[PDB]
């Protein structure tokens, strides 16, 4: 399939600026582009992306989302002087015009369309368009909120018309409500629009009642418009991740979009004077990462807001880092979302439950160690395997805690991989197929705890007990099994056939596994599979690489060429095949029991406001 990422930017879109004193628009400056691109150049990301040039959007492409009258009015602007431009701007709300802004807006829409074409033609895996002006506020016959034409709506309609796409997800993480996109697709079930935005009970711009959680779409599009209003400032990484886990991601994976477009407005980042939130730029990596399993990785990230130049550059760098497959940074201090965020999440889940049943409630990169004598054609970012010091450690382990040379070799390979992952910055993750799970798991966990790894997240697909202690606060164990277990220790999550199985797992993956894992913040993920996992494991791997900077060691008991290939492909960063577009009632009941059991210790599991004694 496709590889690489597209970076679409041109200095020309920095050649328009506010020409008069306007305190409402003083923030939207050309430097936003400059700084941004220079950030990517300083850290070396811009050089690693395929540079697709910009083009003008044609008149018909513009008429896809706007009316002929408004297009003509804007076409008149390059011929106006300063007084005429100021009058024309006064005709609209929170926007300014400039002799070059029509040109730059055509260039922004055209760069968006170039990104869409690059992604859909399999020329690149994904990409980002550093554009100006933004788009998500502009409407069919109006410029609005620094926006002239709606770039993301253009991209959606263009993909629909030219690629016969049936399902497109739009994610608006700009701090403002992209009401232009909502208006454009409120009756359209083919374009699922999610937006989060500062609202403060309708007191924050654009002060619209239909920006609230009760706007779910009209007519055939009911349930395909999801507004999440922040009614307080200061929202943190925890609020954003809880929004993703308990609102956006389950709906997105049930929806199974054929293309993901992001209104990447970074005014939701800390330091921005307009959004006034407390999210670190690193969160925008994970956001990006959490969406990449969707649509086989086909993601189009388009710039919107973001006005603190420093945090803007940092957040753009984080987004591009994730788009290229670089290891995501560990997020610490995560916990429960604030009460206001929990109220907003609860309200949006309640109102959307009549459309998405998951919301209803009751009243080198990778190293591979195949079996001895087995040789596979591994992807281009992989390698195979032992030192004499490794053998000394193995002999010490054997003489102190445990005759087969193959199992001793497997333990030595485990130790070598762990050393190359933790102590060395050479390898990132690894997969070892092994016999004797007990000895292998014991050696792996104990050696990782001395790597050192302050915390280890073990994920075991199988039954029975494993040689791992969840007593202290250094190990957390997720076990997906077939038998029942009361699950007493607050440091363990037990999860117990049919067609609904896959639909359950993803649910339990998004609503339970990922929140606890993110709050736990492990230094290493240890995967174990003992022998329908083929359907889900891939996603499970990719998403779980959001933890521990991708440092994951998978242990596979028994040779299955399909399972080994899928594990290595997901660990190496290849795109994930979509699952396609309802869990069992007993399954969701058991999931809710687990959540109510664990949410007191792991606050990121909360999706309702806690009741006070
Ligand atoms: N605050 C009132 C005026 C206003 C309007 C839009 C924005 C954006 O950032 C749009 S992405 C900022 C300010
Ligand atoms: K938004
Ligand atoms: K919609
Ligand atoms: Zn904005």
UniProtKB/Swiss-Prot annotation:
Subcellular location: Cytoplasm; Nucleus
Binding site for Zn(2+): 174, 176, 267
UniProt short sequence motif Substrate specificity, positions renumbered to this chain: 23-26
GO terms for biological process, alphabetical: epigenetic regulation of gene expression; homologous recombination; macroautophagy; polyamine deacetylation; spermidine deacetylation; swimming behavior
Residues annotated as transmembrane: none
Residues annotated as binding substrate: 22, 94, 307
Site (Substrate specificity): 274
GO MF, one annotated term: acetylspermidine deacetylase activity
Keywords: Cytoplasm, Hydrolase, Metal-binding, Nucleus, Zinc
Alphabetized Pfam families for the sequence: Hist_deacetyl (PF00850)
Catalytic activity from the UniProt record: N(8)-acetylspermidine + H2O = spermidine + acetate; N-acetylputrescine + H2O = putrescine + acetate; N-acetylcadaverine + H2O = cadaverine + acetate
Keyword Membrane: no
Key word Hydrolase present: yes
EC identifiers of the protein: 3.5.1.48, 3.5.1.62
UniProt-annotated catalytic positions: 137
Gene3D superfamilies: Histone deacetylase domain (3.40.800.20)
SUPFAM superfamilies: Arginase/deacetylase
Domain of life: Eukaryota
One Gene Ontology term, aspect cellular component: nucleus
Family as reported in the entry's similarity comment: Belongs to the histone deacetylase family. HD type 2 subfamily.
Function text: Polyamine deacetylase (PDAC), which acts preferentially on N(8)-acetylspermidine, and also on acetylcadaverine and acetylputrescine. Exhibits attenuated catalytic activity toward N(1),N(8)-diacetylspermidine and very low activity, if any, toward N(1)-acetylspermidine. Has a very weak lysine deacetylase, if any.
Designated name of the protein: Polyamine deacetylase HDAC10
Organism (species): Danio rerio (Zebrafish)
């Amino acid at each position: 399939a496709a590889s690489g990422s597209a970076l679409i930017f041109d200095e020309e879109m920095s050649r328009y600026k506010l020409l008069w004193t306007d305190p409402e628009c003083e923030i939207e400056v050309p430097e936003r582009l400059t700084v941004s691109y220079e950030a990517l150049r300083t850290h070396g990301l811009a050089q690693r992306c395929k540079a697709v040039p910009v083009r003008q959007a044609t008149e018909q492409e513009i008429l896809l989302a706007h009316s002929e009258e408004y297009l003509e009015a804007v076409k008149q602007t390059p011929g106006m002087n300063v007084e005429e431009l100021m009058a024309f701007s006064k005709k609209y709300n929170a926007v300014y015009f400039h002799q070059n802004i029509y040109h730059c807006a055509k260039l922004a829409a055209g760069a968006t369309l170039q990104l869409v074409d690059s992604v859909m033609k399999r020329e690149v895996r994904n990409g980002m368009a550093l554009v100006r002006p933004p788009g998500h506020h502009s409407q069919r016959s109006a410029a609005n909120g620094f926006c002239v034409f709606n770039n993301v709506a253009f991209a959606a309609l263009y993909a629909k018309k030219n690629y016969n796409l049936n399902r497109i997800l739009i994610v608006d993480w700009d701090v403002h409500h992209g009401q232009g996109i909502q208006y454009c697709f409120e009756e359209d079930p083919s374009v699922l629009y999610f937006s989060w935005h500062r609202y403060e009970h309708q007191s924050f711009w654009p002060n619209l009642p239909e920006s609230d959680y009760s706007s779910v779409g009209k007519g055939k599009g009911s349930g395909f418009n999801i507004n999440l209003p922040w009614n307080k400032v200061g929202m943190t990484n925890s609020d954003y991740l809880a929004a993703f886990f308990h609102v956006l991601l389950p709906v997105a994976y049930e929806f199974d979009p054929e293309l993901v477009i992001v209104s990447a407005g970074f005014d939701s980042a800390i330091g921005d004077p307009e959004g006034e939130m407390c999210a670190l730029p690193e969160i925008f990596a994970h956001l990006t990462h959490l969406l990449m399993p969707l649509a086989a990785g086909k993601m189009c990230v388009v710039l919107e807001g973001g006005y603190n130049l420093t945090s803007l550059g940092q957040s753009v760098c984080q987004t591009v880092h994730s788009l290229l497959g670089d290891p995501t940074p560990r997020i610490s201090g995560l916990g429960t979302a604030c009460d206001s965020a929990l109220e907003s999440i609860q309200n949006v889940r309640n109102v959307q439950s009549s459309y998405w049943s998951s919301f209803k409630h009751l009243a080198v990169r990778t190293v591979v160690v195949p079996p001895p004598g087995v040789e596979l054609t591994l992807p281009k970012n992989c390698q195979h395997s032992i030192s004499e010091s490794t053998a000394k450690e193995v002999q010490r382990i054997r003489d102190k805690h445990f005759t087969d040379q193959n199992i001793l070799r497997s333990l030595g390979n485990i130790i070598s991989v762990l050393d190359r992952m933790m102590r060395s910055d050479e390898v990132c993750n690894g997969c070892v197929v092994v016999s004797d799970l007990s000895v292998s798991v014991q050696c792996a966990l104990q050696h990782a705890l001395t790597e050192p790894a302050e915390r280890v997240l073990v994920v075991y697909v199988g039954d029975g007990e494993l040689p791992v202690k969840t007593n202290d606060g250094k190990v957390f164990l997720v076990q997906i099994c077939t038998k029942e277990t009361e699950d007493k220790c607050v440091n363990r999550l037990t999860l117990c056939e049919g067609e609904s199985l896959t639909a359950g797992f993803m649910q339990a993956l998004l609503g339970l596994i990922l929140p606890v894992a993110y709050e736990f913040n492990p230094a290493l993920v240890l995967g174990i599979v003992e022998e329908r996992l083929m359907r889900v494991w891939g996603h499970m791997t990719c998403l779980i690489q959001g933890l521990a900077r991708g440092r994951m060691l998978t242990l596979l008991q028994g040779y299955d060429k399909d399972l080994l290939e899928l594990t290595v492909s997901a660990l190496s960063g290849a795109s994930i095949s979509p699952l396609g577009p309802a869990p069992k009632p007993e399954d969701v009941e058991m999931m809710e029991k687990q959540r109510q059991r664990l949410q007191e210790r792991w606050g990121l599991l909360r999706c309702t406001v806690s009741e006070s004694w």
